[PDB]
């Protein structure tokens with residue numbers, strides 16, 4: 001078929017250093033194009049291993065060009081109303097989808113390392129897709145776990161052990177960031193600048209002062225889950241299999 005390989009760049013999508021929408025001249029199929037002038041080699045290699053409904057699909061690469069599954073719903077960040085969040089049933093559905101994507105990644109030995117609402121996209125049916133694997137790395141290979149030591153991610157979303165320890169397990173760090181995402185969705189506010197002993201908001205949380213925001217805005221059920229996720233000691237922190245057994249996680253919700 002002629003012209004089937006021709007794509008038109010019709011509009012600029014987002015940051016990076018640029019995300020553009022490409023439409024096939026013949027089929028009208030759409031794809032997102034990640035443009036980086038120009039690290040990228042690894043992002044491509046990891047992307048090639050991914051195949052899950054809650055992870056942005058990688059089509060190929062042709063400076064460097066990254067061709068990805070187009071998510072017309074944009075960033076989850078934009079569905080969060082400042083100081084409000086979003087309806088609990090919507091937050092729960094997004095959280096279920098986030099967990100499914102994270103379980104998948106962890107199952108293949110990959111850690112994202114930068115989970116936050118700006119890196120969680122939504123498709124036309126509002127299905128959540130984990131995006132931006134520029135910081136991702138392998139934490140398990142040949143059934144052997146490798147400890148992480150590199151400090152990376154985004155401050156308000158990073159787990160405390162990253163700041164305090166020379167080495168740390170990958171999985172609990174991603175679990176922690178998911179908890180910060182859940183907090184944002186339910187409160188429309190991040191709980192602290194960073195989980196440091198010098199941060200008053202973090203000290204307040206460790207002291208269980210849940211009568212304060214953002215906690216006060218969150219229902220007891222999801223709050224009880226957050227109490228299990230945002231645990232300082234990563235070895236005591238709830239794991240995904242246990243999150244799947246949580247009361248709120250399993251609560252039927254409807255708007």
Ligand SMILES: NC(=O)Nc1sc(-c2ccc(Cl)cc2)cc1C(=O)N[C@H]1CCCNC1
Nearest residue numbers: 013014015016032068069070071072074118
């Ligand atoms: N694969 C894909 O479709 N990506 C999209 S669609 C979109 C989009 C934007 C606006 C609308 Cl209205 C619809 C879709 C923004 C981004 C995107 O990747 N943005 C990156 C920027 C840097 C932080 N991570 C996210």
